[PDB]
Amino acid sequence: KHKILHRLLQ
Amino acid sequence: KHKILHRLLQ
Amino acid sequence: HMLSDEQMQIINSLVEAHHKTYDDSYSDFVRFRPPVRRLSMLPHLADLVSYSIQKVIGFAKMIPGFRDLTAEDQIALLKSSAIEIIMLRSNQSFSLEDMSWSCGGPDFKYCINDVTKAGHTLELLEPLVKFQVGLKKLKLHEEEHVLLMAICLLSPDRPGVQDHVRIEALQDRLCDVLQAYIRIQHPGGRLLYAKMIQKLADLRSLNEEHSKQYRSLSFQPEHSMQLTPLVLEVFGSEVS
Amino acid sequence: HMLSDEQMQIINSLVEAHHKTYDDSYSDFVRFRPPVRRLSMLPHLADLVSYSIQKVIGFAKMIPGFRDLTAEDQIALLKSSAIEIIMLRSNQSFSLEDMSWSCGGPDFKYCINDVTKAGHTLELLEPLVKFQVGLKKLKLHEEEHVLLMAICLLSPDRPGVQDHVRIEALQDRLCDVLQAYIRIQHPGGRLLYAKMIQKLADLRSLNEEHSKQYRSLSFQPEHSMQLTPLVLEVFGSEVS
Ligand SMILES: C=C1/C(=C\C=C2/CCC[C@]3(C)[C@@H]([C@H](C)CC#C[SiH](C)C)CC[C@@H]23)C[C@@H](O)C[C@@H]1O
Ligand SMILES: C=C1/C(=C\C=C2/CCC[C@]3(C)[C@@H]([C@H](C)CC#C[SiH](C)C)CC[C@@H]23)C[C@@H](O)C[C@@H]1O
């Protein structure tokens, strides 16, 4: 869940 | 689930 | 020694379905995220594939009997076969002279090198291009090309299909049509049906390699975020 | 009567963060699906918003203290506030002369009429444009504009935040900075802080109306399929 957000938050 | 596919299949 | 009337209805339906869902002008391509030549071509190619999936859905819906399958079976067939149909239908833009897919202008000419800049490797792209030239050399009639796409789509040996007997019966009818068409209407095509069936086998191997490499893209969120919702759905692993 | 050294460090950090994540040349815009003038502008505007969310994430990550919040709180703040920050940061491209957002060339000039062709109504677009002109008339220093984006982002009264006390303390520090900056560095700004706080209230109302209208788009798969994965994630309703 929120896979892209986690990645962008580093 | 498969929300777009279902829609495109009419 | 002659095609039956119900056989030629099938051919007519399939040809019309392909003509309605394959636009030879390629004018919609300007609507995609523009090509850029790390994965500079991933946005353009993602949009190309997403657009092509919509066309393959539209073609499937006009195959005799497909719309009478259950929604789950329609999805199962499309999820396992969409990439193969895209590979088959792309032969129409493939050029033996350039070893490339030429879709109108030079901005929409795709080399092997372009596809590597969308995250794929020669392990896929070498067999894919050999497949395109071998298929192009068969010099298929439009009737045959569309029959092969329909036979490919209506394969019962796909993960997740339920009504195996109904789909195999549909595919059997289409194979009968294609065998009869080649025999009666294709001069010098004694070995053609066997070659076309082999190409279906080749597509299975290309499907496998593509899915392997797609899993690498989709597991890296900075790449998967460049895909479209439709690509994520169709190429994804969710099960109905 | 004078800004403290730690206060001006905060300002410097925030200004640098905004400069790194707001490109005044708008040259990346050519990478979006092109604008088309039913929802002809939805592909271009979806890409514009998706691109802008990435910038807002990048700005957030450089706000003092944001990166020390829990991942869940970082997501909670971004999910409720991203649309407000986009509305605030877009004031930099908004023109009082044209009543439009002008991002370089005429292909990237956005009217109210353009946004209606992405699925939104005057119920949102009328208050949004009134908000832009009122905000533009405040004539904010860059220091103030970036402080207001940071205060907006660091609001503890958002659904799903856990560490309320830590976030409110961070926002309190930023508000103190902004009050002191206006008093000392903004000639004739006696009423400015109150006006800026009112704009935060306005953004809540714009947020509500946008989310309402976004729900209509996202519930229609032929429209939601035009969005990006990042927009679906950030504007979606999933909870961590
Ligand atoms: C798509 C079509 C066309 C060309 C097909 C091409 C060239 C670009 C790369 C593609 C797409 C391959 C990729 C390995 C597939 C992928 C992916 Si996705 C993980 C970036 C499979 C087929 C390849 C143009 C036109 O003939 C319509 C036709 O439908
Ligand atoms: C996005 C930005 C810019 C302009 C902002 C605009 C103009 C286009 C329509 C937008 C996006 C509104 C929409 C109602 C929001 C949406 C949506 Si969605 C449901 C298609 C909110 C802000 C509006 C350009 C530049 O200043 C960078 C800045 O970040």
Please tell me the experimental approach by which this structure was elucidated: X-ray
Under 8 Å between Cβ of D114 and D120: no
**Domain range for C95:** 1-239
CA distance D3 to C201: 74
Which of C33, C224, C228 has its CB closest to that of D32? C33
Phi, psi of D34 (to 5 degrees): -65, 150
Side chain identity at residue D87, one-letter code: M
**HSE of D178 in the Cβ direction (CA atoms, 13 Å)?**
28
Is there a binding annotation on residue C19?
no
Residue C161's SS3 state is coil
Pocket test for ligand 2, best of D21, D23, D93, D206 (most atoms within 8 A of CB): D93
Q: What 8-state DSSP symbol labels residue C231?
A: H
CA distance linking residue D112 with residue D232, whole number of Å: 23
d(CA D108, CA D44): 10
d(CA D96, CA D130): 11
Ligand 2 in reach of D93 Cβ (< 6 A): yes
* Chain B residues within 8 A of C79 when measuring between CB atoms: 5
Index of the ligand 1 atom closest to the CA of residue C92:
26
* Least Cα separation, residue A9 to chain C (angstroms): 11
Q: Is the dihedral of CA D4, D200, D231, C27 positive or negative?
A: negative
Give me the number of domains chain C comprises. 1
The protein residue whose alpha carbon is closest to atom 28 in ligand 2 is D90
Resolution of the solved structure (Å)? 1.9
Q: Any known ligand binding at D141?
A: no
3-state secondary structure labels for all residues of chain A? CCHHHHHHCC
Ligand 2 centroid, distance to D210 Cα (angstroms): 11
User: CA D33 to CA D47: how far, in whole Å?
Assistant: 7
Q: What CA–CA distances, in Å, run from D166 to C4, C146, D86?
A: 79, 63, 24
Full 3-state SS string of chain D: CCCCHHHHHHHHHHHHHHHHHCCCCCHHHHHCCCCCCCCCCHHHHHHHHHHHHHHHHHHHCCCCCHHHCCHHHHHHHHHHHHHHHHHHHHHHCEECCCCEEECCCHHHEECHHHHHCCCCCHHHHHHHHHHHHHHHHCCCCHHHHHHHHHHHHCCCCCCCCCCHHHHHHHHHHHHHHHHHHHHHHCCCCCCHHHHHHHHHHHHHHHHHHHHHHHHHHHCCHHHHCCCCHHHHHHHCCCCC
Supply C217's token pair: 């893209």
Provide the 8-state DSSP code for C140: -
* C contacts of B3 (beta carbons < 8 Å): 233
Query: Residue D177: which CATH number?
Result: 1.10.565.10
Give the residues across from D94 on adjacent strands. Answer: D101
- Residues contacting C197, CB < 8 A, separation 6+: none
Looking from the CA of residue D55, the nearest atom of ligand 2 is 29
